[PDB]
Structure formats: structure tokens, C-alpha cells
Amino acid sequence: GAMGDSIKQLLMAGQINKAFHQALLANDLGLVEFTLRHTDSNQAFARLEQKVLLSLIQQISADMTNHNELKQRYLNEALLAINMADPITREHAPKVLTELYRNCQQFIKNSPKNSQFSNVRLLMKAIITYR
């Protein structure tokens, strides 16, 4: 619809953060996934604002009942893109990562057979380093 269309438009224009603002302010993880499906990861992760990265981390991990490779790989890349020299990130990241951790812990208990199981376990180790 109108949101997805606008998002595809923004992304083609190279207005990547504006596309993600729209996707992330909609409170719709399906629209976020649509957005991730149409964005060039080598544009995204070359780049996305720190505030966008921390929100994406939040939103993807808030609901991991249908966690997958696309979202895991973005969780991976978004974490690796966290810039701990950014004073806002330095204040806000601790909280976002603690909740990411807590959600990953619930995911590995809920979904032991899931394809992303060991990937999330590895992510939880990486998180410890950021924290």
C-alpha cells in the first residue's frame, strides 16, 4: 500500500534512513521485514543512523517467534555497526543490548530446534563484549 510504496521510493532515491524511519515508526514488524527485503545491505551497512540501528535491533528482537536468516543477519550487522564512540549510543546501547540479550535468551529456550539457534547463541556472546 501507500507506506510500502513510499518506502520503496525512498530506498530507490537512496534516502535509506527516511525509509527506515517510516518502517520503524509504523509499529509493524512485517513492514520492517518488507523494508529489509528491499534494501541493499551493502548500502545499509557501509549508512543507517545509530538511532535506526538500535530501533531495528529492538524491533526485530521484540518478537522472535518467526525469527529467520534475514532478520538474524540484520541483527548481526546492526550490532556490528553500533558505534560506541557516539555519546547517544553509549548511553542508550546498554539498555537496548540488555533487552536484546533477554529476548535472545527467551528465543533460545522457546525455539531450541530453530535454524538460527546457534547464531543467536553466538550473538549473545558478542553482546557481552559490547556490554
Side-chain angles (χ1 to χ4, degrees), residues 1-46 48-131:
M3 251 167 199
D5 289 351
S6 173
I7 283 158
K8 300 208 285 175
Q9 182 150 56
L10 288 166
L11 291 176
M12 300 211 83
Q15 295 176 317
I16 189 166
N17 287 291
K18 297 188 191 198
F20 275 74
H21 293 158
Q22 177 63 262
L24 293 166
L25 291 175
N27 177 42
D28 183 336
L29 188 52
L31 186 64
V32 176
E33 295 180 48
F34 167 89
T35 309
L36 297 175
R37 168 197 318 145
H38 290 85
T39 119
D40 188 338
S41 315
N42 306 267
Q43 295 193 40
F45 299 110
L48 298 180
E49 279 168 2
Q50 293 284 295
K51 74 176 158 218
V52 162
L53 292 168
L54 289 171
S55 178
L56 185 59
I57 284 166
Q58 190 274 307
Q59 293 206 17
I60 291 171
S61 73
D63 178 23
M64 304 181 67
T65 54
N66 204 58
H67 196 64
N68 51 37
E69 222 194 43
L70 170 58
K71 287 184 297 184
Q72 184 50 35
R73 193 264 295 216
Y74 273 74
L75 283 186
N76 288 346
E77 297 284 356
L79 177 73
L80 295 176
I82 293 181
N83 168 24
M84 287 313 285
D86 177 317
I88 289 182
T89 299
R90 135 184 318 282
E91 187 204 7
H92 190 39
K95 280 93 189 128
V96 171
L97 303 176
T98 294
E99 195 59 13
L100 167 64
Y101 197 92
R102 185 155 170 101
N103 285 131
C104 290
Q105 94 196 9
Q106 297 298 302
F107 171 78
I108 60 166
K109 296 172 183 284
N110 291 341
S111 302
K113 306 300 165 293
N114 196 270
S115 182
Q116 304 303 108
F117 180 81
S118 294
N119 301 269
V120 169
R121 293 175 74 215
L122 179 65
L123 184 83
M124 291 168 256
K125 291 290 164 168
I127 284 176
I128 296 183
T129 299
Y130 283 94
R131 282 208 288 162

